[PDB]
Each structure stands twice: as C-alpha cells, then as structure tokens.
Amino acid sequence: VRPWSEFRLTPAEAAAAAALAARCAQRYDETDGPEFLLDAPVIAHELPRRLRTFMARARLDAWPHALVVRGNPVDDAALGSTPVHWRTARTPGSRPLSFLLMLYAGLLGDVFGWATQQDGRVVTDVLPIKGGEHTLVSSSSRQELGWHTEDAFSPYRADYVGLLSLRNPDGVATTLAGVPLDDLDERTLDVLFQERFLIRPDDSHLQVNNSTRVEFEGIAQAADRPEPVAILTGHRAAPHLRVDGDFSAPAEGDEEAAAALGTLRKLIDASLYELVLDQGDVAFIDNRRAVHGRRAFQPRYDGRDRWLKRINITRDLHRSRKAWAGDSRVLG
Ligand SMILES: N=C(N)NCC[C@H](O)[C@H](N)C(=O)O
Ligand SMILES: NC(=[NH2+])NCCC[C@H](N)C(=O)O
Ligand SMILES: [Fe+2]
C-alpha cells in the first residue's frame, strides 16, 4: 500500500510515448512556444490508452498525494551531462523528455510558469548548482529542501507539480506529507482553517535567482506585506493545505495561531515520507493535498548529478487571470 497512485508503463507503451514526444520535438521549435502550449493537450490524446485511462481516473480519486508513472526509458549517453545551471539546461539530449513531460501534463490541466522563476520558463530544471548547496531553493543539495506547498504565497499556485527524473544515480528521495488528520485535534484544526497565518514567497522568486521586470514588484509586496490567510481550506474531513515549513508564520502576536502552526510542523515532520524518482519516473504531486521537499544529498559536480524537469499545472488557467503577465502562461 502506498499514499500515491502508481502506474508502470509496459516497454511497448513507453516506446510509443517516447516516439510521440520525439515527433513533437521534430515538429515544434520549443515546448514553451505558444504553438505547442496550445497543441500539447490534444496531441496527448494520442498517448497509450491505458495511460490515458490511469490519468483520467487517478486524478478523480479522493486519496492520492501524487500520481506516479514509472518506466520511461532514458539513455544517459544520449541525454548528455547534467548542466551546471538551469540557464543552459535546455540541452538537445533532454529535449524529447521535456516534450514528454508536457504531453503527460496536458492530460491533467493547463501548464504555466512564473515571470519571476527561471526566466518565465514553463518547463523548468531541478539540478544542484555549485555554490548553492545551502539555499532554500530546488538547486540546493547539502541542505535538505524543507517541505512546502509549491508557491504557497500565491493564490495562483499550481494544483499539480510535475517532476520527470532525467537521472538520479544515487537514489535521492523527494519527501511528501499529507494533512495529519489522524492527529490534529478539533480546536487546532479549527484555528488552521482561520485566516490567521502569513506565508511569503520563497527564494526562487528573488531577482538573484533569475537572469539579468515588473512582476518582481508583486513578490516584494507579498514578502513585505503578507495578508493573513488560512492554512487549511475546504472539507474538514479532507482539507486542502497551504503551508511552507520554513516561511509560514502566525499573524503578528497571535499565540493561538502560533500554537496550531507549531503543532502542524511537528505532525508533518513526524509523517513525512520518501518517494524516490528513479531515472525515467514521473510524479505529479497534488499541491493541495500534500507538501513536498527533497532530502539532503552530497552533490557530485562530475556531470552525472541528479536532474529533474519540472512543470506547474492548474486545473483552470482563468483562476489566475489577474496575474496573467502579458500572457496567460507566465504569471506575475
Ligand atoms: N524551501 C522552502 N521551504 N520553500 C521554497 C522552495 C521551492 O521549491 C521553490 N519553488 C524552488 O524551486 O526552489
Ligand atoms: N497552434 C499551432 N499554430 N499549431 C501549429 C504549429 C506548427 C507545428 N510545427 C505543427 O506541427 O503543427
Ligand atoms: Fe517544490
């Protein structure tokens, strides 16, 4: 038994999916281009039927923290070395796999990026950056990436975060936890449902973590003057979750809120579990049901470091209309 839902491709299914992604990579200039963004969800209809059935059904299940698809082939020789920075990470060897991620994602929802993260790319990169080992972003290594709701600070945060493992030779675990409903007392639960918490943008939205405009103003506003929000929403018997283990704080001087958040931190720490994304595995983490992070690891810096492609997915792009930054697919 697992807290996520898992699908394993047969070799024939995996080869068919790879061939579809390869054909897309031949026919379109880039994954993030307007043309492929529009076409991917319809092209995805040509993926193996058993996979389409899994994605359609598993998304509607009440319980999973993630949907995990195993068994996509990745040839390290074709892939080439792990890039030294996300800027240079759109390598030809990784290009078909980026298209593949986009196709799988298009079965689940509308993909988007952030003006203030990796130059507004929709398909982004997770890899260790030398000098960045002890940061709070996904290019860390030696310091554990603490558990978080992705883009907790924002009302426009993803419903699902997709991760495709290009390589992970040493088996470094992603971490996950759901709401600790078996342990939260009613009074604590009640407080977590009230708008008594602060949650600021994480460091990935800082200018220092993009390349050499206006959307950074909103990040500054969210950091300097966060509005109180709830941590839990929806059904008390199955809440949705919005929290950042580093950055969540109580509203100013609200000691009851503080106690509830402290209790939540302890209970999530105690229930955190591991999911290892081996080479070729894809996970779609349910960003309303679960927090996620990544274990500490010693980076290699020898060309074979752990490397993921990543994508944000919303069920409804129109929900973020306000934040459409001169187009609907890059937000700020
Ligand atoms: N480290 C914490 N607690 N939160 C922010 C980390 C996020 O995963 C961020 N989007 C990143 O990619 O670095
Ligand atoms: N949304 C679009 N305009 N799609 C068509 C773009 C052309 C692309 N090379 C193709 O194979 O179709
Ligand atoms: Fe994350």
Curated annotation (Swiss-Prot):
Domain of life: Bacteria
Pathway recorded for this protein: Antibiotic biosynthesis
List of residues binding L-arginine: 136-138, 244-246, 310
Subcellular location: Membrane
GO cellular component: membrane
Binding site for 2-oxoglutarate: 174, 306, 310
TM regions (residue ranges): 97-115
InterPro entries to which the protein is assigned, alphabetical: Alpha-KG_dependent_hydroxylase (IPR053447), Arginine_beta-hydroxylase (IPR023966), Clavaminate_syn-like (IPR014503), TauD-like_sf (IPR042098), TauD/TfdA-like (IPR003819)
Keyword annotations: Antibiotic biosynthesis, Iron, Membrane, Metal-binding, Oxidoreductase, Transmembrane, Transmembrane helix
Major location (coarse): membrane
Its membrane topology: Single-pass membrane protein
Record has Iron as a keyword: yes
Protein name in UniProt: Alpha-ketoglutarate-dependent L-arginine hydroxylase
Enzyme Commission (EC) number: 1.14.11.41
Enzyme class, broadest EC rank: oxidoreductase
Cofactor(s) named in the record: Fe cation
Species in which this protein is naturally found: Streptomyces vinaceus
Binding site for Fe cation: 148, 150, 292
Gene name per UniProt: vioC
UniProt record similarity statement: Belongs to the clavaminate synthase family.
Single GO MF descriptor: 2-oxoglutarate-dependent dioxygenase activity
Pfam families reported for this sequence: TauD (PF02668)
Reported function: Involved in the biosynthesis of capreomycidine, an unusual amino acid used by non-ribosomal peptide synthases (NRPS) to make the tuberactinomycin class of peptide antibiotics such as viomycin and capreomycin. Catalyzes the stereospecific hydroxylation of the C3 of (2S)-arginine to generate (3S)-hydroxy-(2S)-arginine. Usually clavaminic acid synthase-like oxygenases catalyze the formation of threo diastereomers, however VioC produces the erythro diastereomer of beta-carbon-hydroxylated L-arginine.
GO biological process, one term: antibiotic biosynthetic process
Catalysed reaction, written as an equation: L-arginine + 2-oxoglutarate + O2 = (2S,3S)-hydroxyarginine + succinate + CO2
